[PDB]
Every structure is written in structure tokens, then in C-alpha cells.
Write a protein that binds this ligand. Structure first.
Ligand SMILES: OC[C@H]1O[C@@H](O[C@H]2[C@H](O)[C@@H](O)[C@H](O)O[C@@H]2CO)[C@H](O)[C@@H](O)[C@@H]1O
Ligand SMILES: *[C@@H]1O[C@H](CO)[C@@H](O)[C@H](O)[C@H]1NC(C)=O
Ligand SMILES: *[C@@H]1O[C@H](CO)[C@@H](O)[C@H](O)[C@H]1NC(C)=O
Ligand SMILES: [Sm+3]
Ligand SMILES: [Sm+3]
Ligand SMILES: [Sm+3]
Ligand SMILES: [Sm+3]
Ligand SMILES: [Sm+3]
Length: 434
């Protein structure tokens, strides 16, 4: 696609900190951009939509190449249309925002400049942030994660995409998502089928795969930390049922691991660590700090801070594994106790190091789950298992929570607020800011 300026594109600002082993932290100026899919797509020369509800214009947009020549992405009104505001080092994202239409959720990327995403090399370093999940009920997911996207959004490889990172192009993740309207400089109309349960989406014939590190998927009830390796580390288009991922016949038939090796403390047996109120170690009615370290072995360490007290990730006994680090040993024990081989099939933590040792782009989003209602995160899943099944129970939510029309209409003011991002060498992010 190309870019149109009927609505100007101005990225909300957001400050973060770059920390140093020398004891100091230095303020960086970034901005956030919304993903291209949320944007208005219309004709280059006019105002006729190329896309509406969940179908494409037969006239403007009869194939993938032509439709890219005829269509463009416009600017976005972050606050009034998409419920996205920033203030200082803080970013809020609202759930349902009513304007001319009803917008649900947002996915945003941190930017280095007007035209380029900020690339973070995770391996050897740590990422810290603060989050308020108090306004996230059952069924929602305020996510902060990284993906192996190209810094320029695809522009230098696919010259039919002149819009680029400024308009949020280039997304990929380990689900090899096929709901994207534009992939690799072309549209995704060759093959489209509308969603039945969703007025606004559908599934195209192409998907966009890459490595994904889910630092934080959470609401007020449950949280999880999950790396997802792929056989090909960075962004890469896939075709149809062979994409794999959530909406293909065989979830496991693609290049990426859609399950991951997740660590959810409640799932592992600690039902009093994370939750609403002061009967939980971490009280999700209040702001908390989350620190994540990418050890050079490929292991991942986690600790939290709330109201000045530091808590390490809780210990887990899981098969033969005992500890509190997401390593090799834990991943292997998880497969053996909870089932699965997707994670080690696609290379395990070793293959995941190739992602973390190159650049990854920071993503922050809020979403609801048209496929499984977020039950995999905060409830019993699958829905007909009971706690005598290992790892079935992931949170205390009811088995009928999370249906998207339900929560869209009963908690439209849900919001997530992320703030105070700090990034630098291991052990540096507890340094004072400045
Ligand atoms: O694809 C939806 C969701 O699935 C998550 O993997 C689940 C998986 O759905 C289920 O088969 C298994 O029993 O539990 C895992 C781990 O929670 C995946 O982790 C999510 O990222 C994905 O969004
Ligand atoms: C859960 O976590 C806390 C904090 O680590 C710990 O003191 C407590 O014993 C844990 N409970 C269980 C049942 O593992
Ligand atoms: C839940 O239903 C699934 C259906 O696939 C079945 O395999 C599983 O054994 C059931 N578990 C219980 C405890 O009924
Ligand atoms: Sm391919
Ligand atoms: Sm360690
Ligand atoms: Sm080992
Ligand atoms: Sm066992
Ligand atoms: Sm195997």
C-alpha cells in the first residue's frame, strides 16, 4: 500500500530509559504507531473504501497487486478513534471507544523515528516496565511483547509498500496471522473469507510469520510469560492451511510454534501469588513492576516489584524440574507433564536465542479473543477438564467468561496502562532515571 494524508499521522510521544552498567539511566524519546490493520484503507485518488466491515471492493481491489496500486492507508486519530493516550513515560490503551464507528482494542509499536521501529537486542539485557491491570476483567489481555519485524516496515524489500513503519506495516508473529490486510507490499484479498463471529475481520490467503517473545500477557486474574521459536527467525510470508497457527486446520503444520513454553504461576500450582486484593502476594488492584532478563544461556529470569518489596518468580515443581527460571529443563518438563512438542520441534530456547540475539520490535496491545475467549490464560482449558488434569487450570475465571460480544458490552471502559519502560544490561534497570 501507499500512504494518504486526508488524516495526518502523528505518533503519540512516549519516553523510556536506556540503562547502563555504569550506574546511570538516560532518557530516550520515542513514539508509538498503530498497526496498519486498524487504519482506514481507501482509494489513492478518492474516498471510496477499499475495505468495509469484512469485505473488499470488487472494483478497486480485484487481486493482491492491483489493490496495492489502488489503495492507501490513512492517518489515525489515536485518542478519539482508538482510545490510545500517552503521558510522559506512560501509555494507556482503552478497550471499546465509540466515535463514528465502534473500535475494539489496538496494537501499537514503539518507534525510533518517524520512519523506523526501535529494535531491541534482548539477549544479555533486561526489560523493565510498570503496568496497571486493575481495569482488566476476565476475558481481556493487555499484552507487551516483542516480534522479529523489519525496522522499516518492509519498505526496502517490497517497493509496492511505500507507507512503511510510519503506518504500522510489517507485523508478524508466531501465530502466522492471516487476518492482516497487507503483507509484503500486497493486499490479502486473493483468498479472503469473512469472520462469522466478527463484523470487522476475516482471514486471507497469506500470513506473516516470525519469532515472538511474550513478556507479559495478563489481566487482573492471571499472567503469563511465553517464548515462541520459529524455524525462520524473522518476518516471512506463508500460504493458507500451511501457515499453521490459530486459524489453520493443523495449528502445528507451519514454521512457528503457536503454543510456546509458557510460565503462568497459577497454572504451575501457585494460586495465591497474583490476583485482586491483599490476599495475593502481588495485588492486581495496584500498579506493579515487572522485570525480565534474557540470560546469555537462553534462559529467562523474572522478578516483580510492588510498593518497594521485591519478589522473585515463584518456585515450581513440574515433573523433574524444580526452580524458578524458564530454561531448557523447564520447557522440556512442561511438554512431558502438560503435553505438546511444538516448542522443541521448532528448536526450543536455542532457536529462540537467534531471535533474541538479533533485533526485535516492542509491541503493546489490548485485545479480546474471538477463538478461545482468553480461557487458556485465566480459566480452565480446555473447558471440560478439571483440576485433576495437569495444567488445565490457569486462573479462577469461569468457564463461560470472555465471550467477546459479552465483555465488549459489559466492560467497555476496561483499560491497560503500561509505563516506565527501562531497558539495558542485566542488573542495570534498578538504576535511578534521568
Ligand atoms: O491459540 C490461542 C492461544 O493458545 C495458547 O496456547 C495454549 C493452547 O491454546 C492450548 O492448546 C494449550 O493447552 O495451552 C496453551 C498455553 O496456554 C498460546 O500460548 C497463546 O499465545 C495463543 O494465543
Ligand atoms: C506462592 O508464592 C509465594 C511467593 O513466592 C510463596 O511464599 C508461597 O509459599 C507460594 N505458595 C505455594 C502454594 O507454592
Ligand atoms: C474433556 O474432553 C476432551 C474432549 O476432547 C477429552 O479428551 C478429555 O478427556 C475430557 N476430560 C474429562 C475429565 O472429561
Ligand atoms: Sm514461506
Ligand atoms: Sm539465572
Ligand atoms: Sm539442562
Ligand atoms: Sm506427572
Ligand atoms: Sm519432534
Amino acid at each position: 500500500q501507499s500512504a494518504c494524508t486526508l488524516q495526518s499521522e502523528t505518533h503519540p510521544p512516549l519516553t523510556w530509559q536506556k540503562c547502563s552498567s555504569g550506574g546511570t539511566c538516560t532518557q530516550q524519546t520515542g513514539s508509538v504507531v498503530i498497526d496498519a490493520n486498524w487504519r482506514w484503507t481507501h482509494a489513492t485518488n478518492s474516498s471510496t473504501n477499499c475495505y468495509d466491515g469484512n469485505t473488499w471492493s470488487s472494483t478497486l481491489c480485484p487481486d493482491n497487486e492491483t489493490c496495492a496500486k489502488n489503495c492507501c492507508l490513512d492517518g489515525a486519530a489515536y485518542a478519539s478513534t482508538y482510545g490510545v493516550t500517552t503521558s510522559g513515560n506512560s501509555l494507556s490503551i482503552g478497550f471499546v471507544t465509540q466515535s463514528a464507528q465502534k473500535n475494539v482494542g489496538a496494537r501499537l509499536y514503539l518507534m525510533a523515528s518517524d520512519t523506523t521501529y526501535q529494535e531491541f537486542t534482548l539477549l544479555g539485557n533486561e526489560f523493565s516496565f510498570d503496568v496497571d491491570v486493575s481495569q482488566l476483567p476476565c476475558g481481556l489481555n493487555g499484552a507487551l511483547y516483542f516480534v522479529s519485524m523489519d525496522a522499516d516496515g518492509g519498505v526496502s524489500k517490497y517497493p509496492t509498500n511505500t507507507a512503511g513503519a510510519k503506518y504500522g506495516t510489517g507485523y508478524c508473529d508466531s501465530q502466522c496471522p492471516r487476518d492482516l490486510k497487507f503483507i509484503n507490499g500486497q493486499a490479502n484479498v486473493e483468498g479472503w473469507e469473512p469472520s462469522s463471529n466478527n463484523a470487522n475481520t476475516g482471514i486471507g490467503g497469506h500470513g506473516s510469520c516470525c519469532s515472538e517473545m511474550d513478556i507479559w500477557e495478563a489481566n487482573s486474574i492471571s499472567e503469563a510469560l511465553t517464548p515462541h521459536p520459529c524455524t525462520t527467525v524473522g518476518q516471512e510470508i506463508c500460504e493458507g492451511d500451511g501457515c499453521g497457527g490459530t486459524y489453520s486446520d493443523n495449528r502445528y503444520g507451519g514454521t512457528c510454534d503457536p503454543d510456546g513454553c509458557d510460565w503462568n504461576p497459577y497454572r504451575l500450582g501457585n494460586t495465591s501469588f497474583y490476583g485482586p486484593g491483599s490476599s495475593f502476594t502481588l495485588d492486581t488492584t495496584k500498579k506493579l513492576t515487572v522485570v525480565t532478563q534474557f540470560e546469555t544461556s537462553g534462559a529467562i529470569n523474572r522478578y516483580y516489584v510492588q510498593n518497594g518489596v521485591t519478589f522473585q518468580q515463584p518456585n515450581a515443581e513440574l515433573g523433574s524440574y524444580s526452580g524458578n527460571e524458564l530454561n531448557d529443563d523447564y520447557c522440556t518438563a512442561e511438554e512431558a507433564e502438560f503435553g505438546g512438542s511444538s516448542f522443541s520441534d521448532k528448536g526450543g530456547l536455542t532457536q529462540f536465542k537467534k531471535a533474541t540475539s538479533g533485533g526485535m520490535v516492542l509491541v503493546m496491545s489490548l485485545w479480546d479473543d474471538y477463538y478461545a475467549n482468553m480461557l487458556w490464560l485465566d480459566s480452565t482449558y480446555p473447558t471440560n477438564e478439571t483440576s485433576s488434569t495437569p495444567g488445565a487450570v490457569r486462573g479462577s475465571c469461569s468457564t463461560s467468561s470472555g465471550v467477546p460480544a459479552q465483555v465488549e458490552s459489559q466492560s467497555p471502559n476496561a483499560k491497560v496502562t503500561f509505563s516506565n519502560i527501562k531497558f539495558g544490561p542485566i542488573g542495570s534497570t534498578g538504576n535511578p532515571s534521568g
